[PDB]
Design a binder for this molecule. Structure first.
Ligand code: THP
Ligand code: THP
Lengths: 135, 135
C-alpha cells in the first residue's frame, strides 16, 4: 500500500536476548536488574553467549526459591545494576555458570569478593573438563 | 549459616509473564512496548492466558518479517504503550488472536478503529466454531 489516506506498515524486529550474567527479578516489590558478581559470560551474539543466557534462564525460572545476596562492597554499579550473588534453590547461579564453563571469573574487586575462591574452584574444574569456553 | 556479620540472603521472585496482547519489539532503533489495538486477551494467570501468550509469541518470534501499523488517533496509551496493529509475514496478530478465540474485540474507539470490521468478522467465526474462550 502507498495511499497517504490509509494506514502505513513499518518494520520492526525482536529485541536482542539479555546476556547470561544479567538477571532481572522482582525484588522488594519492584523490578530490578542485577549483574552477577565475580563472573563474565560472553555476550549473546558471541559463541557460548546463547548457552549462558539459556543456562541462567533455566536455573532461575525453574527455581522454587530465588534469593539475592549482596557483598560487603558497592551494592550497585555505575549502570544502576544490583551487584549480587543470586541463588536458585540454594545453588548459586554465579558459581554454576562458571562450573559449566559459561562464564570466566572476572571483576574481582576489594570488598565484593567473598565467594572468590569458591568460584575459582568451579573455574579450575570447568577448565580441567574443557567445558564450553574452555573447549 | 547464622553469623550476622557476613552476608545475608534476601527473597526475590520472577517478573510476571507478559500478557498475550502486549508485545515488545525493536522499533526505529529502540525497544518499545506495544499494546495490540482492538483486542483483549485473558491475563496470563486466567484460563487461556498462557495459550494467548504462546500463540502471539509463536506468531511473532517465528516471523520472517514483523511490521507495526499505528491507527489515526492516539499513538500511545496512558501506560506509554504504542497502540498498533502488528503483522507477522503479512498476517495480523490482532486478527489472528481473535480468530482463534484467544482474545475478544474490545477498546474500540472511533478514530483508532480502522480494522474494526475485520476483527469483528474474525470474532463471529471464533464464536461460531466455539473456539477456546467461546467453548
Ligand atoms: C560485575 C561488575 C561489573 N562492573 C562494570 C564493569 C564494566 O563497566 P565499564 O565497561 O564501564 O568499565 C561493566 C561490565 O559489565 P557487563 O559484562 O555486563 O558489560 O560493569 C562493575 O563495575 N562491577 C562489577 O562487579
Ligand atoms: C487497547 C487499549 C487499551 N487502553 C487502556 C484501557 C485500560 O486502561 P484502564 O483500565 O486504566 O482504563 C488498559 C487495558 O489494557 P490491558 O488489557 O493491557 O490491561 O489500557 C487504551 O487506553 N486504549 C487502547 O486502545
Amino acid at each position: 500500500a502507498t495511499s497517504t489516506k490509509k494506514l502505513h506498515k513499518e518494520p520492526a524486529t525482536l529485541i536482542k536476548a539479555i546476556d547470561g550474567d544479567t538477571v532481572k527479578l522482582m525484588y522488594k516489590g519492584q523490578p530490578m536488574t542485577f549483574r552477577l558478581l565475580l563472573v563474565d559470560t560472553p555476550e549473546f551474539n558471541e559463541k557460548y553467549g546463547p548457552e549462558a543466557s539459556a543456562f541462567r534462564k533455566k536455573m532461575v525460572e525453574n527455581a522454587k526459591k530465588i534469593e539475592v545476596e549482596f557483598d560487603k562492597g558497592q551494592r550497585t554499579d555505575k549502570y544502576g545494576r544490583g551487584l549480587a550473588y543470586i541463588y536458585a534453590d540454594g545453588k548459586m547461579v554465579n558459581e554454576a555458570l562458571v562450573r559449566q564453563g559459561l562464564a570466566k571469573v572476572a571483576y574481582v574487586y576489594k570488598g565484593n569478593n567473598t565467594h572468590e575462591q569458591l568460584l575459582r574452584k568451579a573455574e579450575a574444574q570447568a577448565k580441567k573438563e574443557k567445558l564450553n569456553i574452555w573447549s
